[PDB]
C-alpha cells in the first residue's frame, strides 16, 4: 500500500506477466486457475456468453501445446486487456462457505 514506490512495483508485475507465458497461448489469468470444489461452483454461475468464450480459449491453447507452437505476437494477450471475469463470482462462493462454517461451530 505504498504510494511513492508503487511505480517500481507496477514494473515487477509487468515483468512477471511476460515471464509467465499463458499470454503466448492466448489465455487470460482466470483461465489458468486450479479447479477445486469452490472454483467449480463459480464456473457454473457464469452467463452463457462468458462460459462459451472460456471453453474455446482453453481448447485452442491445448491444441498449440500438442504441436509445441505458440501464437503470432500480434495475438498475445496484453497486460491491460486481461479481464478478471471470474473473480466477482468466486468471492461470493467463498463468502457463503465461511458463513456455513461459523454457523456450525456456534
Amino acid at each position: 500500500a505504498v504510494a511513492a514506490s508503487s511505480k517500481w512495483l507496477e514494473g515487477i508485475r509487468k515483468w512477471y506477466y511476460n515471464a509467465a507465458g499463458f499470454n503466448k497461448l492466448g489465455l487470460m489469468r482466470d483461465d489458468t486457475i486450479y479447479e477445486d470444489d469452490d472454483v467449480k461452483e463459480a464456473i457454473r454461475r457464469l452467463p452463457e456468453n462468458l462460459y462459451n468464450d472460456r471453453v474455446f480459449r482453453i481448447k485452442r491453447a491445448l491444441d498449440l501445446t500438442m504441436r509445441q507452437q505458440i501464437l503470432p505476437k500480434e495475438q498475445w494477450t496484453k497486460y491491460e486487456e486481461d479481464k478478471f471475469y471470474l473473480e466477482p463470482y468466486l468471492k461470493e462462493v467463498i463468502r457463503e462457505r465461511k458463513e456455513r462454517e461459523e454457523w456450525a461451530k456456534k
Binding site: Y16, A20, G21, F22, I33, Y34, L62, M66
Partner: protein, 378 residues
Amino acid sequence: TNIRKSHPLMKIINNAFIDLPAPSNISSWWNFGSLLGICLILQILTGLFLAMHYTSDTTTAFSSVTHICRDVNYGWVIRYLHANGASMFFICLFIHVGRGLYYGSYMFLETWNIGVVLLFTVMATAFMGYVLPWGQMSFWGATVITNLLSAIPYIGTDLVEWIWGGFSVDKATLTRFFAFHFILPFIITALAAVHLLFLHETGSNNPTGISSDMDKIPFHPYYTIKDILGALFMMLILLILVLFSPDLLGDPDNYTPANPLNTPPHIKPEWYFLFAYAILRSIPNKLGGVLALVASILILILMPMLHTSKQRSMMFRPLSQCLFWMLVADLITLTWIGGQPVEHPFIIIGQLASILYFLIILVLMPITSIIENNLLKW
C-alpha cells in the same frame, strides 16, 4: 451386437485401454508409467530363472552364482539382465516421481498415497537381493543396516536376531533374506493395480494443469502406438549395457567372497542408494540417523497440504522452476558425496546439503508460491 461392449471380459479391456478418454497434449514424460510396468515384468521372469539354480547357504552362495555364469546355458545373459534391469527400474522411477511433483499430480490424493507406499516396497526389495550373492559388499552392506537397526529403543535388538535365523551368520541366514525378496515383488504388482483403479476415476493430468474435458481423444490408436515406441527405445538402451558394458554400474569389490577376516578398502552401495547413505552419515547419532533416512521418503506425503499456489502445475510459475532444479542439483550432490570417503571437505558439504533438501520442500517452496500469487493479484 458390438462384442467389444457386451462381452463380460471384453468390456473391461475396452473401458481401460481402448475407448478411454485421454488428453491430446500428453508429453513423453507420461511414457514412464508403462515403462515401469515393463521393467517389473522383466525382473519377475528373469528372477524366476535365477531362483532354480541359486543356493541360499553362506558356504555355497557365492559359488552358485559363478556356476550359472559359466556352466548353465544362457546364464550369463540372464544374470546381467537382472542386475542391469534393476538400475533401469530405479531410473524410470525417479523420472516418474519428479514428473508428478513438477506438474502437480499429487492432487490426486488416493493415487499419490498408494505411490509413496510403492516407493518403500521397491527399495526394500532391492536391498534384500543385493545380499544374496555374498561378496564383500553383501556382507558389509548387511551389517551396516542391521547395527543401525539395533538403535530402535524397545524392540530393536529383538528384530536383529530374527533375520539372520537367530544366529550371527550361517546357512539358515539367507533363507529369510531370500524369502522376503521372493515375495515382495508380487505385492508390488497388487498395489500397482489398485494404483490405476483410483486414477481411472479422474483420468490424467496434462502439462498445462487445466482440465481438458473438451479435448479428449481415444487411447487407441494414439497412445497405444506411442507407448510401444518408447518401450522399444528402452529395450535398446538396456541391451547396450548388457552386451557392451555389463560391469559399468557395479563395483569390482563384490567379486571377492565375503570374509569377516579380510578388509574392504571402502564401503560403497549401489548408485541409487547413495543419496540416502549421505544423509545417514551426516547425523552423529544412530537414532537420529535412521529417523532422517525414513523422513526423506515420507516427506512426499506432505506435498498436498503444503501447496499454496493458485495454479496446479509449474508451467506458468517461473520462480517455482528455479527451486525445482535446485532440488534436483541437490540430489546429484548427495549422490557424489555418498561415494566419497569421510574426510574434511566431504563432511561439511554433506551436511549442508542434507539441510537444503528439507529447507526447499518445507519452507522455501510454500513461501515462493505466495509471492507469485501476490504478483498476479491472486
